[PDB]
Amino acid sequence: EVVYDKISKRQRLRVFKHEDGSERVLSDGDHVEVGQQLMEGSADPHEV
C-alpha cells in the first residue's frame, strides 16, 4: 500500500468523480483509479 506522507491543509482536496461513487470532493474510502489527482493544485508531470 502506497503512502502519501504529509500535505498541508493549505491545499484543498480534489473535486473529481468517477465510478459513480461520490461526485464531489475526495471522500475517505472512495475508489481511486491509476491516474487520479488526489489534491487541488498542479501535478508534477514527471509523476504522471
Swiss-Prot record:
Induction / repression: 6-fold repressed by starvation.
Superkingdom of source: Bacteria
Role of this protein: DNA-dependent RNA polymerase catalyzes the transcription of DNA into RNA using the four ribonucleoside triphosphates as substrates.
Subunit structure: The RNAP catalytic core consists of 2 alpha, 1 beta, 1 beta' and 1 omega subunit. When a sigma factor is associated with the core the holoenzyme is formed, which can initiate transcription.
Similarity remark: Belongs to the RNA polymerase beta' chain family.
Designated name of the protein: DNA-directed RNA polymerase subunit beta'
Organism: Mycobacterium tuberculosis (strain ATCC 25618 / H37Rv)
Span within the parent record: 1074 to 1121 of 1316
